[PDB]
Structures are given as structure tokens and as C-alpha cells.
Amino acid sequence: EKSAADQIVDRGMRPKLSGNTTRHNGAPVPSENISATAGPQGPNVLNDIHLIEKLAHFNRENVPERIPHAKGHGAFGELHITEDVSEYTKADLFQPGKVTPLAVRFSTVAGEQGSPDTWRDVHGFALRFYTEEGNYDIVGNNTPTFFLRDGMKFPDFIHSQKRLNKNGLRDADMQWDFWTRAPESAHQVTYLMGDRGTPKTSRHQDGFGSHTFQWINAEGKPVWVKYHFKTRQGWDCFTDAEAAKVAGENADYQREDLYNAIENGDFPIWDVKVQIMPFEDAENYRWNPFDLTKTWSQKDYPLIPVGYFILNRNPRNFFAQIEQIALDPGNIVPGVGLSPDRMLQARIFAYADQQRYRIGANYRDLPVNRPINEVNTYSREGSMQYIFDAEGEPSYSPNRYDKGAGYLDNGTDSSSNHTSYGQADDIYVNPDPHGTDLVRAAYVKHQDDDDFIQPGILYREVLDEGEKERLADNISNAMQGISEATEPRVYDYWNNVDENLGARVKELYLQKKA
Amino acid sequence: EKSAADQIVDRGMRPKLSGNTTRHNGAPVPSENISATAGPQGPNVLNDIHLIEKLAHFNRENVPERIPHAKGHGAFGELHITEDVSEYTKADLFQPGKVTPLAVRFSTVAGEQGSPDTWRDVHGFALRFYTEEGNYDIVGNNTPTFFLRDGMKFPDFIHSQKRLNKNGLRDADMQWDFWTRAPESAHQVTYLMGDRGTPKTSRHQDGFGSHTFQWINAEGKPVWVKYHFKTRQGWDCFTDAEAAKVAGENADYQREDLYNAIENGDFPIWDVKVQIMPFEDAENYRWNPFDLTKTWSQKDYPLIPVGYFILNRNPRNFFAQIEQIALDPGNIVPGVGLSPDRMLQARIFAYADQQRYRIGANYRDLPVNRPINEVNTYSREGSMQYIFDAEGEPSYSPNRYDKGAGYLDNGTDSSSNHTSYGQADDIYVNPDPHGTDLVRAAYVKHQDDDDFIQPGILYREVLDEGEKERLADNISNAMQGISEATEPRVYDYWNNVDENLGARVKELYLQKKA
Amino acid sequence: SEKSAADQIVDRGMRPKLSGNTTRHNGAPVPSENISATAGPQGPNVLNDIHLIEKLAHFNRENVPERIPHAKGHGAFGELHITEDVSEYTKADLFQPGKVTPLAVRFSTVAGEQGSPDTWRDVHGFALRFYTEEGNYDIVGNNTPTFFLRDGMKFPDFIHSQKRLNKNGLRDADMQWDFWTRAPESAHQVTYLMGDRGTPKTSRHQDGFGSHTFQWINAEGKPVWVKYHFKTRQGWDCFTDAEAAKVAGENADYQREDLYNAIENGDFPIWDVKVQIMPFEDAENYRWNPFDLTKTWSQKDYPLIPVGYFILNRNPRNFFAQIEQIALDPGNIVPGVGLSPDRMLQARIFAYADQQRYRIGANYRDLPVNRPINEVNTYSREGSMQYIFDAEGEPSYSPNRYDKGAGYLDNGTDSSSNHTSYGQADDIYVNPDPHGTDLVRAAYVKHQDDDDFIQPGILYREVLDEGEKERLADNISNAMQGISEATEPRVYDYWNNVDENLGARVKELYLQKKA
Ligand SMILES: NC(=O)C1=CN([C@@H]2O[C@H](COP(=O)(O)OP(=O)(O)OC[C@H]3O[C@@H](n4cnc5c(N)ncnc54)[C@H](OP(=O)(O)O)[C@@H]3O)[C@@H](O)[C@H]2O)C=CC1
Ligand SMILES: NC(=O)C1=CN([C@@H]2O[C@H](COP(=O)(O)OP(=O)(O)OC[C@H]3O[C@@H](n4cnc5c(N)ncnc54)[C@H](OP(=O)(O)O)[C@@H]3O)[C@@H](O)[C@H]2O)C=CC1
Ligand SMILES: NC(=O)C1=CN([C@@H]2O[C@H](COP(=O)(O)OP(=O)(O)OC[C@H]3O[C@@H](n4cnc5c(N)ncnc54)[C@H](OP(=O)(O)O)[C@@H]3O)[C@@H](O)[C@H]2O)C=CC1
Ligand code: HEM
Ligand code: HEM
Ligand code: HEM
Ligand SMILES: [Cl-]
Ligand SMILES: [Cl-]
Fold first, then answer.
1. Alpha carbon B267 to its chain's center
2. What is the CATH number of the domain that holds C55?
3. Domain total in chain C
4. Minimum-distance CB partner of A45 among B112, B168, B438
5. Partners of A273 in the β-ladder
6. Partner-chain contact C399 B32, CB within 8 Å
């Protein structure tokens, strides 16, 4: 409470009503209890209008769930800026003193809508900031990295984490068959199989933008950034056995936790920080700075504070404001840009594409998805158009009226006669493409770029002995059910991360198997 | 290793393919691994055609799940008739020696896709018989009764069993607030709260049609019937604690069990039996024979054997044949009719209505939904029309061609000139309607009709002391979370079933409270 | 009437002829198609007349979103026959010597909706599918060698300006000309459109063109740039503005009916397939930007080279199922064919399948008319109305330990990590110099004679005969009726910039008719 988000979360909400019910045309309902028949023991009549309306709308309550990240929950709150980063970005929401309303949705990845919150899985950490220059979404995860570096492979990964086509069962052999044949997965798989694969709540986990993004300042100068959201509640994790116990006791443990916390005034807080890499330092970093499977060392690029955000408002209506929210990494704003991360670039297409289907063509007009400023667009019509332009405004640009065109355009013509605008920094200021042809090529290879060195460093230099052993324990548990064919491939995969981890994984797996 | 269902389940299946993949136009795919960029570090190009197609179709994999009964699984098999019931029904599939292909889907009711199979719940038990006179579906449950006697109340019950609007949580206070204020629920709630609320598998439970239906013989003579599907595997139930434990360990426990049992050759079997009430017996029965909340005593109307069915074929593709199956109690055939059960009459509208939305206008044309005989219909067009009529056939009747009209019609005119056909026995031969006006009325009151006698009979005359105790223990567990306002309502509700059950419920409830 | 190579395709999905009585969609017999069930003869209609509700509910769902644009159209099926040897230029299977390939075609107008006249003045779509052994190859062309714009960003602006005002649902001359004069790149196509060819009499009496520059690649990987021309053996034959408007009223489906009748009568329409072929190394030196859709290649510089012909010899069996639901897409390319740096073309490669996913459904590729003759081997799955599914238990992901496979550049067993590179994506196109290394918003590379007006001026001054030149001015001044006073001088200047004599005659005729 009480709360900069109130202007957003109150949108679309009816006043409280009493007395009797009405049909959807507003006329009084005679009964919610008894349907009309032709004689007490006679047949139901076709023209019990309320009955049919009630049943027919009930029949249409469900919509396609997200793929992936179907199971989730969220809240609203406030972003507060506490440091001055104007030398790096001109983005309005990050300027000194700014307070911006936010929405957040937390989620798992693989499971469907009814599935337990505490299955071992990556957790989504997706933020919307309702800024004065548009909705800026940072659609992140509770991990600084991810399983892949090319969006072409994303549907393969997600099918491998979901259900077999023949019987609708999730499958260990399929999961490890994919992971070990796509060894770029090694970094994120090591993270996933550790303690953090099973955080207790949504409040007790960090969030990350994961990808490298770009910040552009008022002079048009760019820097590369990575977002970190550090939990003030601290990381707190279940064991593998505890996470499964909780799954059976309360499939909605984390959903209920976050709701309860906010209701109790126990508002969770994250500190907003960035790693900042100078534009010209990208090519010489020991790892490729645009490879999603590579984190930037915090020794090389320490966390730099920006502000914090707080979750202080539960949704008014879960379906309307959480299920229907359309969080999209393509929702960037002036002062923020993308990068040559191929995963990120695929995502920039993919989210709005699914949302057009899952919600509908006009999903942007729903209360939770509208920005605080008016949208000035030539888009029109489409299913369920609630909002429409002022009477008689033009439908095309360039036109002879006032509605306007792009800020690069003159508003009066098509920019013919060989007009050029130059570098598209609003997308991003690009580094060298390293070629002039359309190609299918590897990422530029940096000195320490391979699939295994980073999880190896995590194991050897970061984890304590308890974490190392639990990791081997979790892995060997997650291997139960794989085929004889897959066993040696998995042994080798873990040996590539680290030989001691590999040995312990194999030892524990064989102990546990019959 | 063959099944009568082989003809059905092979419909729509591709041959095994190898080599390289193709785009959906059939052109070869260059890579499933790397996307095309403008330079190795350049931006992703818009025209990686395969990339966009792969992502866009991935984005559209999900469809609305069923409401209710979202979480389910199934198989295919054979119905075998071993008795002669031709005196009672002319239905082709029920004639002596008939062997009919079948499909079945089992499910829970309240939870979404991915919710655990072993949540306490009713379990769906929905059969399709691919008969020579059309698909006959018996969309039943693992209970002989149900929670309500009027379809007007059905969406209220289902919302109460799903999630609160504000926070997406299922809620004990909500569930009990509804049940106690709709005391007609008492019979089914007593059944649900016992051992049978947690069957171990889909094989270890009976199925029932629940509703009274009608059978009509070759002479047009009607009798009232109830369907019973008696498991040869026998009832086998988890305790409340065991069912929760399984939910956390394997959310798909029953799905996996049925698949494995069939794959292993352990084909589950049910004996098909009916209760048969003479048409003239209906008005005289001690209970209203059309009240879904009332079972017919098996001492008054014993089970009469018809035959058995066996499940001997797993689906080829789970989504295509199970998620997309459209089971519908309105799928009746000659020899079978409905009844003045208002729940049944609402369902006859409701299923196809949801299926037109959930699947699409042309859902009937999907492989699993087509009958074995050709469909002769004047319906046309609609989204995704795969199947169309012979070239140039007429789109309207009556017409000057050969396509035809209804079997009561002459095929050449509109049946004007005050043509009449008489009683619609294909719907059902109706009993006395007990009035001539459109009304909202009670069911005709029979001698022993109330909301509490039958679950009371179950408790006092059927359950053993161990069943009675676990019942109270289950109920008192399910009460955890109710408000103080709701507490005495729940006490009264159980006292009304049996005062000893009620007192034991309260005792355990207070012990556990906190 | 005997047969077509396309018979395999058009018979897919068709029921046998049925008689006797109707059935519900579960297959059970229908009692009546004439009388519904009531509780007593004068009593209320009962809910459980199952057939009544099913019949009404399916009726209620017959309509689907029409195409935007090109809503009004019709088509046929036929055969492509190769009669020359172009193997030196392309390896595309359907273009090899002696090949006979089944085809579909859809013709259309552009702006009007489904009920609108075939003979409103408009571009006509000329959209072909070839069901080749290496996939469906679609050439989604028009009856003009050029088009109104050179950047896809402007396409929705053009199409809204050709459709209806938001306030009142009326089409509007002022809006059309306000857009065209503010987007002068449109001058070439507007000149073509406002001439005789804006009103061809039938679908049979017009040429077709691919319009865009595409690429051909041969068996050795060498590319050439190409433009497709489909030259009508029936000959161009056009209405005057007045005749076309009269026919629009007399028979809104004049062209749909003509094509159906012609094929039923055995008068199978034929087009000769030809290409212009520009050597890859010629591109930078051509007097016009060879990738700018608003620029044609002179046939004096690049003469038509013959490839073969195609013939339409089969009417659809069912119009909705096979024509309304056809999903023609320029992104349906096959080996031996590539794209080009034409920005309109590149936008289209995204746009069509996107609209088809919506207007038909996620699984539109599986409908009979959209399936290729070869089996599709894909990891795509599920989605609404999935009819076809993979063999039992096949994997849903690659790389996998099974045999389903992966891309032809992949090894089928791993993810191509360890810094694997495949090189130039020639299956998209062998690209020319990009002329920059940054993401930019820039003009096309400017060639010697590139502007918005020289080509229609050439058409007017060097190609059109005196009657065509006069009918052009007359047609233009008719289409101008309704423009605002503010719009008048813009249109005067526009036509002046094409040709000062044309502009003078347009203004003269316009003022005479005003008013
Ligand atoms: N650089 C980054 O953006 C991050 C990297 N990592 C992993 O740590 C390795 C070292 O990175 P670097 O920043 O150079 O070294 P640092 O020592 O500076 O950082 C180590 C990071 O690992 C986190 N961590 C601690 N325990 C676990 C665990 N059980 N599972 C997963 N993460 C844990 C730490 O969180 P805390 O400080 O609270 O203990 C800290 O953020 C990398 O290889 C990467 O795999 C992990 C998080 C962020
Ligand atoms: N009449 C019916 O179609 C059914 C009735 N019932 C319940 O039994 C009561 C008496 O019916 P009536 O047929 O006259 O008496 P019966 O004694 O003839 O039948 C009692 C029925 O209850 C079943 N039953 C046994 N234990 C349980 C339990 N733990 N939970 C639910 N059902 C159980 C029996 O199955 P079994 O033979 O395996 O012991 C049997 O089918 C009714 O009030 C009703 O609640 C239950 C199922 C069917
Ligand atoms: N180059 C091309 O791909 C085409 C160009 N044009 C137009 O012709 C101009 C000259 O091109 P170029 O190839 O150098 O000259 P060419 O003399 O070699 O060909 C001129 C083309 O214009 C066609 N034409 C004739 N009358 C009309 C008319 N009423 N409306 C539209 N087109 C007509 C001709 O068709 P026909 O031989 O049957 O008389 C011929 O194809 C261009 O500026 C362009 O506007 C038109 C069609 C194709
Ligand atoms: C190329 C790789 C990826 C693609 C194509 C992709 C695509 C998608 C799509 C289409 C959705 C559903 C969106 C919706 O329907 O509203 C989704 C959900 C989501 N994705 Fe990804 N994703 C990718 C990788 C990632 C990465 C790397 C992250 C984090 C850094 C991420 C985080 C999320 C989150 C948090 C959600 C749920 C958002 C919400 O809570 O509503 N994804 N993804
Ligand atoms: C008026 C009361 C009821 C109404 C309006 C109703 C409506 C529905 C609807 C609309 C569906 C989804 C169907 C689909 O989308 O394919 C459904 C599912 C189902 N219902 Fe009911 N229902 C009612 C009561 C009952 C009763 C009394 C039974 C058992 C006798 C039952 C058994 C089932 C089963 C088994 C399913 C899932 C079928 C499957 O596995 O696909 N329902 N119900
Ligand atoms: C950037 C420019 C353009 C875009 C974005 C575009 C987009 C579209 C779209 C989305 C459709 C609907 C397709 C469907 O729903 O099946 C369509 C129809 C069509 N377009 Fe375009 N178009 C463009 C320019 C052109 C050009 C230059 C041509 C010809 C060379 C063309 C020829 C056609 C034809 C013939 C149809 C109808 C196809 C049929 O008969 O089904 N369009 N266009
Ligand atoms: Cl609908
Ligand atoms: Cl869509």
C-alpha cells in the first residue's frame, strides 16, 4: 500500500454491487438456482435466456496458457531511483528521483497451469515499469544465464522439458538426451541442479535480465549493461526432497506466499543494480559478452546500484491482471537498446506473436497492458476493439491532417527522394558485425569461450562442500529414469563441467539405480 | 496385438520419416541449430523463414483446456456384448454378439492441466463407442450420483471448486460456503469425502452414467436405465495422506499407470451392467427417479449384465487423440434417449457448445471425433474445413437433387400444409410433465425425497466403522481454512447427514485447528 | 472432363456422394430438417432438439475473416509444363527440362471486401502455387510488373487509404489521392493502374508478373537475378472505365464466373512462362536500382527468355475449402530460388504466413489445398485443430538420439556448438554488397536514373499510343471526383511530374467534369 500502482490496478474494476443479479444486457435475473421447464417434470425450454448465457460464458472462461511459463502469479509495486545513472542512460524511469509504478509476474517454466510451484525449474522474474515514455518490460529469470545461445533451438529445449508426444508424460531420458546433445546448456543446467533449482518462495530469490542490453545516454553514447535484482529477503532454498513434499502439500505454495506477504504488509524488496561494460571493451572481454550462456564476472564488472523496487499491491483480479498481462522484452523505451544476443533477438519477435494469439489482436488495450500515456497509432479494428481514435482521424500516414508520423519523419511525405536517417540506435548501436553477408555462423570466439568453463568455475571456486554434494545428489536424482543409451553421455557431460563432480554424479547415480 | 480400435487410432498418422527436416511447405530445412544473421555478430535477419515458422507455430501449440475436467488421459479398446438385452433396446452396439471400437478419457474435475491426478476429486469416466449408427458417448463419472439437480447451479459449483477471483487460490471457505448453502450436494460430498475420493488409478474404480437414461426397443417401448461399469481390477484407494504424498512425487500417477498397464499387456476390463426401471414404475418409486442426487437402490433394481469392455490400445498421439477428443453426452444414437433430469438436459447443450470454442467449429472432423459411417450434413464452411461434400452437392433442403433430408421428411418439400410427425422419442418418450405452463418449479416430490437421507443411508447402513472414521478424518482435513462464520454451517451440514458423523467431524476438526 | 495433374490435389478431402437421409455430426440419423421439437404443438421449443442447435451453431460459424487485402477472388488448378532448358541458371526441380508440375492459382482484386465487384478499377492479384517434388513453390504475383511502394513500413498506410474511412465506413477519393501524392514513389504503379490495364475484362486476358526481383541459383551455387513474366496467350483485353463500372453493377462476379465457365467449356487459359535474367555482376551498374520494386527492368536491356507455359484445366471441387482457404505465400520458396534486397519482398516473407495463422488457424498448412505432395518432416506439433500427427513416439526435439533428423547443414546428432559455422545463407539469397555495416534507416542505393517519375513518364512518352494516353487522362480525372480543394493542386503537381502534357490534360478534363 498504497500505492503508485493504484492508477493501474483500479482500471476496469466495477464498483461493489448488491441486490440481485442481472443478465449481461442488464435485465434482472429471476433465479440463479432453478432453470425453466415445460411443467415441473417437463423438458428444459430453449429460451431460459439466463441459463444459456450463464452456461455459454462459463464454457468460454479458459484461454490458451502461456508456452512456456504457464504457472505463475504476481503483484504490483513501485520502482524507486536512489542513484544518478544519467551519464549512462537517458531512459526516463531511471533518471534521478523517479518513482515508477510496476507490475511483476513470477513463474515456473515447464509445467502447465495447475502444476506445483516447487517442481525443480527455472523461475521467471518478469517486470513491467509503467514509464512516462511507455511500458518498459524487463522479462527476466532467477538466473543470470540460460540454456542456449540461439533462438532456433528454443522450441527444441522447451519440447524436451514438456511431455512426450505419445503419452503426455514428462521424461528424464528426453531431458538429458537434449541437454547432452546441446552442451551449451551446461552452465544453466549446473545452476538449475544446485540449491537454486528449488527456491522456497518468489521473494527469496534474485532476478536478472540475463541478456546483455544497451543503455544510451542523452548524447547518444552507448554502454552495455546487465540487470541484477538482488533480494533483500535473501536466497532461501528447499532441498530436492523438501520441494517435492511441498509440491504435494501445496501446489500453489509460492503463489500463496506472495499474496500472504503483501496482505500482511511484509512487502518484499529487491535492489536494482547493473553491470556496466564500456562499449569498446566488448571485443576484448575474455568471454563473448553477447553469448547468453556466458555471465560477466562481477570481479570484472561489479554491481552498480540504481535504486530498488518494492511489491506493495496484490492484484484486484488474478485472471484479468496476471493471466492477461502481456510481458514482452520488446517493450523497450528511449534510453534502452538491444544487443547481438541471438536469443534476445528471437524473443523480441516471439512474445507479442504469442500474445496476439493467446489473448487476441487487441491485447494491448486491456487495462494491465496499456501504458500511462495515450497511444498514438494507425493500427485499427481487429477483434474486440474497445478503444478507438478520435472521430474522423486519419487511418494512414503521411496525411494532410494532424495525427502525425514518426519522429524522424516530417509528417507530410513518405521520405522519398533518397532520404536517409542513419543509425537505428533505438534498436541498438551495433558493434562490428564481423562480416558483410547473410550467414549461419558461430558467435565471435573469445579467449575463454567454451560450453563448460563457467559451470566449472562455479563448482570449483564458488560452491561450498555442502552445495557441491547436494548438486551431485540432485543431478543423480534427476537422472533416474534415463535409458542405458543415455547414461554414458550424461557421465561425460558432467565430467566436462568438472571431473570430481562427474565422478560423484556417476557414483551416486549407480548407488541409487538398481 | 491388434485392436478393433486400430482403424480409428491410425487416422491422421504420418509414416515414419528420416533424413532431414522440411519447412511446412515441404522445402528442406538448412538448420535446426543456428539462425541466420547479417554477419556472425550482426542482427538476426527477418527472412530466416524457418526460424519464424518454428517460433510462430511453437507459440500456438496451446489451446484452451476443458472446464471442468482439464487434467485427464485415455485409451482405446473394445466393447463386447455377452448378453441379450434386445428386449429393452434396439441400439445397434448393444445387440447380441456386437463388438464395437471405443475410446475412453479419465480425468479429475477441478484442477488445471498439470495439476496432480491424485488430488481428492471426482474422477471422470467418459466413453465413446464408434457404433455403426454413429458415435455413442456415455460421459460418466466414478460416482453413481452428483452434487446438484439443476444445471443453473453448475457454474456456481465449479467456480467454488476452482480459484478465488482475487488471488488465484483454491479455498476451503469458498468450497464449504457453497456446499452448505446448496445442501443437495450432501449425497455426493459424502461419497467424495470417503475412501473413493482418492482412487489409486483409473483402472481401480467403477464408472457410472449417473443420470437416468432411456432405452427404446424395436417396438418403440421405453424403459428407464442407469449404466454401471464394474471394475474387474476392483476399487483400490489411497488414504488422504497417501494421495497427497503421491501428488508431490508423481502428479501424473494415474496417467502413467494406465499407459504402462496397457503397454505391459495388463488390459483393464469393466463389466457393463444396467439397472432397468419399467416406465410405469417411475411415478411410484420412493425417490424421484430423475433426480441426479438420488441413486436407485440396487435392492430395488439389481444390476443386469450386458457385456464388458477392455482397454487394449494406447493413443498414438496424446494431444491429437486425447486432448482433442470431444466427448459429449448429446452423442446419442437410435435406441437410446434422455430423461427429465435437468442436469442431463443442460449437459446436452453444454459440451458441444464448449467444443466449438475450445477446439473449433469443425471439431467433429478431426480423426478421433469422426464416426465410422459417412456424415451426410448440410453444414458447411467454418474455420479449418478439412472435409467437404462431393462436388456440386446442394447446400439446402428441400432440394431437387438426391442428397436427402430427415428420415421423417419426404426429401422434396418443407413439410408445410400442417404436416405433423408426433412424439419425439429419439429425444425421449416423456413421462407426465405435471403441468402445462412454463415454470420454475421443484422436482415432483416422491415419498422419501430430501437432501440428506441417501448419504445418511450410506453412512449408517453401508460403510464399515473404519470407513466412517476415515470419512470424518477426511472431512475434517478438508475443513482446514474455513472461516468462523462457516464453521457452524459445516457442523449442521454433517449433523444432517448423521449426528454421529457430525460430532466426530467437529471433534477431529477442533483437534486439528491451531 | 478427362484429367489434370492437379486431380491428386483437388480430390483431397472430398466426401463420396451421399443419399438417403441426413445424419448429425456424430453420424446418427436426423429426424427432420423441417420441424423443430416443442413441448406440445403450441408449447415452447425444447432445449434438447440436438440437431436444431447443432445446425444453427455450425451455421453461426461459417464465416471466417476475409483476406486483407485481396478479399475478393477466385481460382483454378492446372499444370506447369517446361519446354526450354534453363538448368544453367537454376537447379529448382520444377524448372528442369520436361517437368510437369500441378498448380493452383487465385486471382483477385485488392481493396474491396468479399461481396465487392471483380471489375472495380484495381490491381489484380495473380497468385500461383506449384506443387513441386521439393515443396510448394508459390509465386504470389500481380497483373503489374511493378507496385506502389518500396518499403513494407508503408504498406498498411497504402491499404488503409484504399479502404474505408474510420468514421463512416465509406471509401474516399480524397484519402486515396492524399496518400498517393504524399507518397510519390507510387507514381509508376498509379500510372499503370489508371490506364487501360486497371480494368482488364477477365482473369484470362491479363499478364501476370512476380514483380519483385528474385534470385535463381544453379547446381554449382551460382546466382543470377530474375523477374518472372507470365504472358497471356489470350491477350490483354480491357474495359473502358465506363464499361467496367457498368459490369461492376450487372455482375459483381463477372471474372469469377468467366473463369469457371471457360474451364467448364474446355477453353483452358494458357500463359507462357518467361524470365528476365540479370547477371549478378550487372546489378550495381544498372541505370536503375534493380531491387526497387517501383523500378522495372527494361526489356530492351533484359529481354524475356522463355521457360515454358502453364494451363488452367481444373475448376475447384469446393470454392470455400480450396480457394478461400488456400494460403498463398511468397515465403514458399524452394531450392534453386532465392529472395533479394527488395524491402517490400522481405516484409511480405513475414506477413502472409502471419495473417494465415490468424485468418485460417495455426494448422492451416495441413488443409488439403495447402499440403505439398511430399511428406512434411517437422518438429512443430499440437495447436488448434491438429488433424495430422507424426508416427507414434517420434521425438519432439532435435538434436535427438533417434532417426527423425535435423537440417541438411546439421549433423543430426548435436546442436552445432564448438563454434560451428555453415557460411553464406544462399537458400535465402546470395547477397550483394550491403553498402554499410550498421543497422540503419536509409534510402536505397541511388542509381543514375533513379527517381519517382521517370519510368511512368517513359511509359507515357514512349510506350502508350495516343488513345491510351487520352483514356489515361480521362480515367485519372474520373478517379479524382470527390477530392478536396486542398488535394487538387497536389494531384495536378503529381501528374505534371510524370509528364507535363499528361498533367495538363488531366487538369483540363477534371475541371470539365467538376463543372
Ligand atoms: N557473474 C554473474 O552475473 C553471476 C555468476 N554466477 C555464477 O558464479 C560463477 C562466478 O561468477 P563471478 O561473478 O565471476 O564470481 P563471484 O564470486 O563474484 O560471484 C559468485 C556468484 O555465485 C552466486 N552463488 C553462490 N552460491 C550459488 C549456488 N549455490 N548456485 C548458483 N549460484 C551461487 C553468488 O551469490 P551470493 O553472492 O549471494 O553468494 C554470486 O552472485 C559463474 O561461473 C556463474 O556460473 C552466479 C550468479 C551471478
Ligand atoms: N445404488 C447405487 O447405484 C449405488 C449406491 N451407493 C451408495 O450406497 C447407498 C445404498 O444404495 P443401495 O444400492 O440401496 O445399497 P447396496 O448395499 O445394494 O449398495 C451399496 C453400494 O455402496 C457401495 N460402497 C461400499 N463402500 C462404499 C464407500 N466407501 N463409498 C461409496 N460407496 C461404497 C457398494 O459397493 P461394493 O459392492 O463394492 O461394496 C454398493 O455399490 C446409497 O445411499 C448410495 O449412497 C454407492 C454406489 C452405487
Ligand atoms: N519492363 C517491364 O517488365 C514492363 C514495363 N512496362 C512499362 O513499360 C515501360 C517501358 O519499359 P520497357 O521494357 O523499357 O519498354 P518495352 O517497349 O520493351 O515494353 C513496354 C511494355 O509496356 C507494355 N504496355 C503496353 N501498353 C501498356 C499499357 N496500356 N499499360 C501498361 N503497360 C503497357 C508493353 O506490353 P506489350 O508488348 O504487350 O504491348 C510492354 O511490355 C516501363 O516504364 C513500364 O512502365 C509494362 C509492362 C512490363
Ligand atoms: C529465444 C529464446 C526465448 C524465446 C523464443 C522465448 C519465448 C517466450 C514466449 C513466447 C513466452 C510467452 C509470453 C506470453 O505468451 O505472454 C515466454 C515466457 C516467458 N519467458 Fe521466454 N523465451 C525465450 C527465452 C527466455 C529467456 C532468456 C528469459 C529470461 C532472461 C525468458 C523469460 C521468460 C519469462 C519470465 C516468461 C513469462 C513472462 C510472464 O510471467 O508472463 N525467456 N517466453
Ligand atoms: C449440468 C451439469 C453439467 C454441465 C453443464 C457440464 C458441462 C461440462 C462441459 C462443458 C465439459 C467440457 C466438455 C469439453 O469441452 O469437451 C465437461 C466435462 C466433463 N463432464 Fe460435465 N457437466 C455437467 C455435469 C456432469 C455430470 C453429471 C457428469 C457425469 C455423469 C459429468 C462428466 C463429465 C466428464 C467425464 C467430463 C470430461 C470428459 C472428457 O474426459 O473429455 N459432468 N462437463
Ligand atoms: C510489403 C508489401 C506487402 C505486404 C506486407 C503484403 C501482404 C499481404 C497479405 C498479408 C496478404 C493476405 C494473404 C493471406 O491472408 O492469404 C496479401 C495478399 C496478396 N498479396 Fe500482398 N502484400 C504486399 C505487397 C504485394 C505485392 C508487391 C504483390 C505482388 C507482387 C502482392 C500480391 C498479393 C496477392 C496476389 C494476394 C492474394 C493472394 C491470394 O490470392 O490468396 N502483395 N498480401
Ligand atoms: Cl465460439
Ligand atoms: Cl494469431
1. 21
2. 4.10.91.20
3. 3
4. B438
5. A228, A305
6. yes
